Design a binder for this molecule. Structure first.
Ligand SMILES: CN(C(=O)[C@H]1CC1(C)C)c1cccnc1
Length: 171
């Protein structure tokens, strides 16, 4: 059975207990912490591409009101985010299983942009998700996995200084 684990869940959970925030910029900002995934149970010899996307966890706009995040009352449907291809893709199962798959080069933006960067809506909550796509073979297959521990709200600047302090402490 294909197994997907989050690396450094210890640390993600500290961020999650505070409500995590990720900066978005017009040019695109890399994530901290970085999503790193442990994968076992692939065919060492089969070909796979890793995809990362961000699910809108709810349909609301969030605001930091008197030291607390609180959702708006006017939900709107959220169009799905674009997919980021891990730059090691396509690659053999052995490649993906020899070390945690690290999405260190994805950039989060608030503006529709050339290529690479993934556009999110500021003040929406997101749940990172990967797709593992078996390619080249006769039988295409997709395995998907969400990471609730890695949920964050997209922000143009940090609101909760406890997040700011954790970000620096651990970078
Ligand atoms: C890098 N790459 C893939 O891994 C393809 C299997 C996909 C569809 C996810 C690719 C290459 C050119 C154009 N699109 C996607």
């Amino acid at each position: 059975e294909l197994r997907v684990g989050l690396e450094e869940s210890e640390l993600w959970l500290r961020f999650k207990e505070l409500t995590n925030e990720m900066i978005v910029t017009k040019n695109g900002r890399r994530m901290f912490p970085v999503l790193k995934v442990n994968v076992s149970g692939l065919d060492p010899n089969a070909m796979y591409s890793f995809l990362l996307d961000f699910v809108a966890a709810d349909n609301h706009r969030w605001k930091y009101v008197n030291g607390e995040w609180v959702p708006g009352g006017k939900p709107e449907p959220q169009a799905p985010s674009c997919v980021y291809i891990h730059p090691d893709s396509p690659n053999f199962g052995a490649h993906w299983m020899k070390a945690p798959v690290s999405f260190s080069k994805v950039k989060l933006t608030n503006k529709l942009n050339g290529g690479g960067q993934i556009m999110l809506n500021s003040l929406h909550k997101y749940e990172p998700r990967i797709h593992i796509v078996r390619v080249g073979g006769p039988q295409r297959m997709i395995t998907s996995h969400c990471f609730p521990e890695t949920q964050f709200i997209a922000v143009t600047a940090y609101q909760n200084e406890e997040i700011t302090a954790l970000k620096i402490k651990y970078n």
